[PDB]
Amino acid sequence: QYQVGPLLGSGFGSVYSGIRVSDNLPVAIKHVEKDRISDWGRVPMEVVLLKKVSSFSGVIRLLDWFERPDSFVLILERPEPVQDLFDFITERGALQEELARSFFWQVLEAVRHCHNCGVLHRDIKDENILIDLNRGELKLIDFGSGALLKDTVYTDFDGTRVYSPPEWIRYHRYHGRSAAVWSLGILLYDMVCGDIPFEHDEEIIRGQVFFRQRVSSECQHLIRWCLALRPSDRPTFEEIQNHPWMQDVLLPQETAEIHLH
Numbered sequence: 001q002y003q004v005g006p007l008l009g010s011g012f013g014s015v016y017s018g019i020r021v022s023d024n025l026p027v028a029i030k031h032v033e034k035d036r037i038s039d040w041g042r043v044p045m046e047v048v049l050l051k052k053v054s055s056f057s058g059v060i061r062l063l064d065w066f067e068r069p070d071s072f073v074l075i076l077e078r079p080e081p082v083q084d085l086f087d088f089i090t091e092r093g094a095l096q097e098e099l100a101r102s103f104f105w106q107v108l109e110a111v112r113h114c115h116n117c118g119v120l121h122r123d124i125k126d127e128n129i130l131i132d133l134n135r136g137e138l139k140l141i142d143f144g145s146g147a148l149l150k151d152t153v154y155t156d157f158d159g160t161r162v163y164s165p166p167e168w169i170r171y172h173r174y175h176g177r178s179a180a181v182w183s184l185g186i187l188l189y190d191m192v193c194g195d196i197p198f199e200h201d202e203e204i205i206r207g208q209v210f211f212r213q214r215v216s217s218e219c220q221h222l223i224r225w226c227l228a229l230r231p232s233d234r235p236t237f238e239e240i241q242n243h244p245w246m247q248d249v250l251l252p253q254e255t256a257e258i259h260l261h
């Protein structure tokens with residue numbers, strides 16, 4: 001069936017590079033131990049969520065999955081060549097606003113897709129975004145801490161803390177969309193400054209954003225908006241994409257030729 005390659009990453013489980021014997025298609029082989037899965041639907045919720053979002057290249061595609069005695073094995077698409085946003089920023093530093101605009105736009109489109117399919121990702125960050133270097137397209141990955149999207153309150157969280165909103169830190173309560181917008185705020189800052197704005201709980205609670213890089217006023221505005229302390233003061237996905245800084249986004253293909261080649 002599949003031919004296993006080198007380990008791509010380890011945590012939310014372990015993920016290996018792979019080739020599908022059928023057609024030599026590049027795939028990724030994810031291994032998740034059953035004893036670590038707290039959410040089921042009988043398969044892990046991660047499988048359910050991935051199936052709901054299959055269609056559109058902004059979200060990672062689930063090609064197949066297998067059940068083993070103690071683990072589940074996920075077969076996911078693998079772009080070639082590819083690099084994740086964390087490594088991309090780590091090696092290249094703070095991104096240019098034009099490039100950050102293109103990336104952030106693609107992520108917004110991706111999360112908007114997840115929501116239409118009734119899925120909440122709950123771990124939006126640089127590490128969970130892959131870059132198809134050739135096509136200039138971004139993919140959202142690792143739905144392992146995500147949930148079915150609801151309009152009521154969430155009292156559980158198992159995503160990245162430094163990307164989590166102050167209402168989570170304070171009260172252990174959040175609503176899906178406003179919380180997503182907050183993490184998007186952290187992400188956009190990460191893109192334009194080369195690092196995340198908050199490290200400790202108290203910084204998150206305070207929500208005072210400092211820019212360590214020359215960033216345009218409009219970008220700072222959008223960032224400070226997504227990072228509003230009160231969830232209700234945060235912009236909606238529509239409000240973000242109608243923001244003046246999001247005007248005139250590049251096509252993914254232009255983005256590659258200008259910024260990736």
Ligand SMILES: COc1cc(/C=C2\S/C(=N\c3ccccc3Cl)NC2=O)ccc1O
Pocket residue numbers: 008009010011012013014015027028030031060076077078079082130141142143
């Ligand atoms: C990591 O690189 C790739 C990931 C994916 C899909 C992945 S990787 C993932 N979770 C992890 C993240 C970091 C460490 C360990 C795990 Cl299990 N979840 C996915 O859907 C594809 C193609 C790739 O080239």
